Amino acid sequence: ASVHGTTYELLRRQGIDTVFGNPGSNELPFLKDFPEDFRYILALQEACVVGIADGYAQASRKPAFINLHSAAGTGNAMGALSNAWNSHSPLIVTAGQQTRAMIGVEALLTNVDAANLPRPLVKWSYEPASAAEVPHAMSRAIHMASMAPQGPVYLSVPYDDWDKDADPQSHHLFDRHVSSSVRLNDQDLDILVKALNSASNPAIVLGPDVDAANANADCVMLAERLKAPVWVAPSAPRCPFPTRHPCFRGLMPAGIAAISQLLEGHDVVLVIGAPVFRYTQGQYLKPGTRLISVTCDPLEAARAPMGDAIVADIGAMASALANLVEESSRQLPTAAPEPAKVDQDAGRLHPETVFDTLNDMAPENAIYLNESTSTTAQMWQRLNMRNPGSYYFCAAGGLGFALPAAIGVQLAEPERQVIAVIGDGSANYSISALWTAAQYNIPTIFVIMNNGTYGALRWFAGVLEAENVPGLDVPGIDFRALAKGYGVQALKADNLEQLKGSLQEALSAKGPVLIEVSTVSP
Amino acid sequence: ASVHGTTYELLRRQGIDTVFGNPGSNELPFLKDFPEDFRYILALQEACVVGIADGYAQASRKPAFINLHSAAGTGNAMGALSNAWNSHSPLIVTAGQQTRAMIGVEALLTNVDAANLPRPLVKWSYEPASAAEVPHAMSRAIHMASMAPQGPVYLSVPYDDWDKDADPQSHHLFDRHVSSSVRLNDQDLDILVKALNSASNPAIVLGPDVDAANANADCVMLAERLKAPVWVAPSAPRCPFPTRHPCFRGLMPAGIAAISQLLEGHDVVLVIGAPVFRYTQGQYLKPGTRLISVTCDPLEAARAPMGDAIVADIGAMASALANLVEESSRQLPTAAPEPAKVDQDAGRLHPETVFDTLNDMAPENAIYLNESTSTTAQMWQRLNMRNPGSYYFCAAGGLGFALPAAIGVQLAEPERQVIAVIGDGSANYSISALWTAAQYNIPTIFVIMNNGTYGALRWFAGVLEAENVPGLDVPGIDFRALAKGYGVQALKADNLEQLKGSLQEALSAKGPVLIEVSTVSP
Amino acid sequence: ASVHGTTYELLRRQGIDTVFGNPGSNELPFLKDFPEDFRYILALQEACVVGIADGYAQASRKPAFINLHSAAGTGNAMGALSNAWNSHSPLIVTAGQQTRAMIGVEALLTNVDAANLPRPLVKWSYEPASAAEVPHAMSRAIHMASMAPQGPVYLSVPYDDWDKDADPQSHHLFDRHVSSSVRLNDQDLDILVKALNSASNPAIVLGPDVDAANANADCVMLAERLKAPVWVAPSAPRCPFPTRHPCFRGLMPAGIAAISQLLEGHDVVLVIGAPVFRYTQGQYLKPGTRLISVTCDPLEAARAPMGDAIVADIGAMASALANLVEESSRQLPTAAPEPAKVDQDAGRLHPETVFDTLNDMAPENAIYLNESTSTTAQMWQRLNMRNPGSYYFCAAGGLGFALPAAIGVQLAEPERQVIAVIGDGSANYSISALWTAAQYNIPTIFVIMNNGTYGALRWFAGVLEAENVPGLDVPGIDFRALAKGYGVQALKADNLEQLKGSLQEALSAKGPVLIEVSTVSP
Ligand SMILES: Cc1ncc(Cn2c(C)c(CCOP(=O)(O)OP(=O)(O)O)sc2=O)c(N)n1
Ligand SMILES: Cc1ncc(Cn2c(C)c(CCOP(=O)(O)OP(=O)(O)O)sc2=O)c(N)n1
Ligand SMILES: Cc1ncc(Cn2c(C)c(CCOP(=O)(O)OP(=O)(O)O)sc2=O)c(N)n1
Ligand SMILES: [Ca+2]
Ligand SMILES: [Ca+2]
Ligand SMILES: [Ca+2]
């Protein structure tokens, strides 16, 4: 067998059948004779390629496979890898290298010091020392991406390796199953469970790794048994809990002081599947509050400024806890009141109005993506997200995620309507991703919130009283024309009447639709 | 509180009371006002400093703390860190940096690009962005070193940080407890246990992480219940099993083909706490053999060329398995026959004779270190090692480990006699370590096997029929004089009579003793 | 031709005939069939191997070739590479890697992420992607080490590459000549020369790159024509000027303020072949002082906090300047007065007495090395060093340089008596280097200054008024016994009478000699 043949067999045997890519000459010997059972998803730029794969991986809860071209293609994707690093997305990033004989002289298209290029944003980065090693190296990549804590990995492969003979002993790689489905030992788990049972006023904080693990339902049970309020850790990349459940208390403020005050009065705070904490912009905890973190990531456990930590699989830990804890006789928290309806005239739309309307009209199993940076708090308060996998927001804050990721999520969840709510500033970073939705008829709905400015930046500047900051406005962009350019149906909504009409049309459409919404300026 | 004060409090609260070091000006603001409850172990070279700390950490099964001087001191230790990386030794390596104001201009003693220096041989490498961050960074270092898979870590700290005010919120770091004591979920563990119960001819292979976890006794029980033969994974850095137990089958050959043949006929092979495999110098497995690996290290799981893998804590997994598996009705393996006594005249000593004599004379709870590279196989067959923590051998093959490490082990185990058996070639790499044993009266016994050559290299050259290789001989070294130079009592053994007499004296001595033994030349 | 054959031909064609090394299995296919015209210098530890090569390279003013074993051997040398980085020493460091087929599984002796190991202390670090590339990669290494600014480089080569067929087109590598012998363009050089001619009170500061370039004589002429005082840049790794020349003003203090005061009153300060500046422990310049730096290193030019800079070859620039500048009518500086003779009784020796005696007795073309850290200022004032290449001191401050480097210098300069003056603390770092001097009969003289303490550290602690610092004393070392251990003749000097007698004997000896001198304690 050839290295090409053996590698594609390893991929399929390991559950991979889709390649997200933008092609180049170094990759042609890999892409040629493309297997009939494989499917190739083309995107026009590497940030888009990885963003689509990322959404696909996160929604599917399985590794996604990416193929990029050398240094320039890999480099074009590194902003996307920054998000993937912080969302623990299992991405197998492969890039083609020059033929081995051409690397030394540094011929055009040579990826110099390839493995160092993607660092520090990868779990593992490698270029094999010989063609026959490629399947073993690919096996390593697959498992490194997939083991907890999941994350992106990088494999650089010389052009000429693919046609070479593979080692027959490579067949041992095909069916390797590696498990990181582990939880705290019985003795220590019993101690933890007793600590929870003994809490007088426990609180639960949940992060993106709960949703990644599909531990949402186990967390609901856990919160019901402990009769404990539940918050989502700040800077949330996913939604780990039903947002209308009686126990749900919403998205935490990202401030250090704000969080300590929020947790004050709670004797035991159980954090699950979140960093402690993804702060932004001053006590860590107030006296009386004990914090215990369950995390799949040693790096998270190491850097928490407070609390005990357990490094384990979130799915295994959530299931164990939900089933071991006693049913508290305490009264179950009462549901948070519905958010107020904001005054809206017949002019430009307040973001609050857009989210209310989306909540009114979207299916109950819709999936939302957020890259409307100044409206996040309102979005969380106004969308009823009952199901797991219902929310994605760039984990590292890297704009250009939501647009391509929404396409990947929709590809992964063909039966759930994806609605990406993206600001006019953010829409540009990965605008070319629209083409992929059009070409493959992936029916994502893109809601562009157009207020003509980088709103979140103006706000921040405003709080700091920072004057004379350049570059905060982005006037003069026609999103209907951009959508048309890439073959996506386009609508505009200058008022509520038009918003409702556009959504009605979009929600009945057979392909992707972009709606440009005129929103109020800050 | 000062950063100095807060950092030493973090250390002691985290169980650290000993600093292994070689001092420099960048480190003086850290070392000054040295706490009365702390103890400072000086070594004359950085390879020795880290080697001593490594032995200390491995024997104590807890992190060791190291303080080195800038780039030159850190660099002098990186060969030692290569061993530590492969033995999963929890070493907290700190190095002093220039004052922040002097880094830019690159004043003398500046550690340029400090964090990159120790990579890739560390789990974590860091230089804090400000003085107040130092305790948090130290907290990160402590936990990164200690979490499974354990390993060395590096922290670079500017001179001037120590006297600065610490953040009062740093007190939250003091009592943080982080656990990686996890094992496979109940459901999947039950499946594994059924697979073991169902095996017709199971075999067990154990690596250094068993001994690190003190899982030895649980592994004995596991092997007795399964009635299974037990081997030690190749290139063994530690001894994970009693070498005279009926089930014990010895050290595996490091060859790929050799191991597949050894495992042939065994339907299920359970590997615990070892890489799969640390080969040297050709099927991975023969048909009929299924391999399952339990490892604390994702990197090990990823790179195994065959078998399933479970990434979990070795102590937790060994205990769970030993207690869950059924008692097989199969007949317990019978003990391997004692090794033959080799012909010995009244002249130079055959290594076989030295090990027999050591086994005859040493206490039953002796601890051995090996850096006699051409005699390893004989050592394993001839020393009865009943207890855990009884054997150490450089995990990466880096010579200069055993001599200092034997001092650290003896410091950690004051009641167990340490006997380091070290070749004449290997003895030189970290010769200056002798001084530390002398100065602190650490009563290690050093047995120098002197055959005047790099024997293992001559052998290897011989197998390859490689001719005209320079640099394989090391004549003209007087180890009694070197020992005298560093203040260690010294004896010579030119024959068996003298070997017995020297050992009798050494085993009754009140301080360190070096015995130079004249061994047969290859 | 084989890769082995082609590589050794490339080496010899490029002027390399000596390999400094400590061998291992990964290196045997390289070392076997060792060419008859090549010579192999064995050292017992890697810090010693590189230190010897470093001294050899610096004295010979040509690249030295090193061969080390994998990660552990490379790591053992990185402290030595820190010195080499700061002295711009052209060292070609090669290390053997596992066979290509064994790298992936990570067999014993695998150098993981090899190229990253030596960074950031190398100009260039590489592992070839195939056997046939090895000669081209070696060509790259040779030229990278040799081009200005010279420095160490690293090449990692898999075991199995050596026996493979070489590309016949590799013959084009053999006679490649690369030049960096460049200087400022005529127009700008004329401007510089006019600036020097126009100076009313010019000063010259010279660094190690002058001595490396053998630009010493041109600098003398330059200083005579400009009638300008000449200082040596602080933390001096070499001596760039005759120390008794009328213009010579000695070693600069390393303080920022100290240097600005020293240069005050000088309208133009010309720095040649030095970083600006290698400070330690506050105006950079005082008003009225203009600084112009000529440096072979862009990194030096970039990081100078003041002055203009020209990045050019020091030899070419010094020659051009010396020949272009006008002969100033100013009166030539008068020679600095001889240093005072310090009171000396019949007891322990004051360092001042040792240096006076050395100056009295040593040949006028002696070469000195310094690693007696508390006596540097006295050494500079008391040794008359008339010739180039007469002084070496660890460029990065990394102790363990002088002892092995003195052996390499003596090997490079067989007709010039090398005298290494090394403190009792420093002597231990690379003590095993003594063996190489003994084995190859390299007649270096080692003067051990024994005061029982890390004197420079006690002094520094004293200035900072830092109390309770551990680890500053090193009692109980017998240097005569250590020398005996490694086969070097040994003498002791407890007083002046014995010092003179020992030196007389050493200076008449036919082999290496170590003299242990009892010096006054701080
Ligand atoms: C790749 C990238 N570039 C720049 C930014 C900085 N940035 C920028 C440019 C923001 C404004 C986004 O504007 P928008 O129109 O998408 O949304 P709002 O008007 O609601 O803020 S939010 C923010 O963090 C970023 N986060 N990521
Ligand atoms: C730091 C380092 N340098 C070089 C080697 C290479 N090497 C060397 C030099 C060996 C010979 C050790 O000789 P010895 O006298 O200690 O023992 P034997 O004579 O029994 O082999 S074994 C081996 O792998 C190494 N492993 N580690
Ligand atoms: C490799 C390394 N380790 C530690 C130091 C720190 N250090 C040490 C340990 C010094 C004392 C050297 O003592 P000595 O006996 O050689 O000389 P003095 O007594 O004259 O200082 S000078 C100094 O910078 C260093 N520079 N390099
Ligand atoms: Ca906007
Ligand atoms: Ca030997
Ligand atoms: Ca001293």
UniProtKB/Swiss-Prot annotation, chains A, B, C:
Binds 1 Ca(2+) ion per subunit. Binds 1 thiamine pyrophosphate per subunit. Pfam families: TPP_enzyme_C, TPP_enzyme_M, TPP_enzyme_N. Keywords: Aromatic hydrocarbons catabolism, Calcium, Decarboxylase, Lyase, Magnesium, Mandelate pathway, Metal-binding, Thiamine pyrophosphate. Homotetramer. The keyword Calcium applies. One of its GO terms (molecular function) is acetolactate synthase activity. The keyword Lyase applies. Belongs to the TPP enzyme family. Transmembrane segments: none annotated. It catalyses: phenylglyoxylate + H(+) = benzaldehyde + CO2. Its EC number is 4.1.1.7. GO terms for biological process: mandelate catabolic process. Mg(2+) binds at N116, L117, R119. Pathway: Aromatic compound metabolism; (R)-mandelate degradation; benzoate from (R)-mandelate: step 3/4. Ca(2+) binds at D424, N451, T453. This is Benzoylformate decarboxylase. Its cofactor is Ca(2+); thiamine diphosphate; Mg(2+). It is an enzyme of class 4 (lyase). InterPro entries: DHS-like_NAD/FAD-binding_dom, THDP-binding, Thiamin_PyroP_enz_cen_dom, Thiamin_PyroP_enz_TPP-bd_dom, TPP-bd_CS, TPP_enz, TPP_enzyme_TPP-bd.
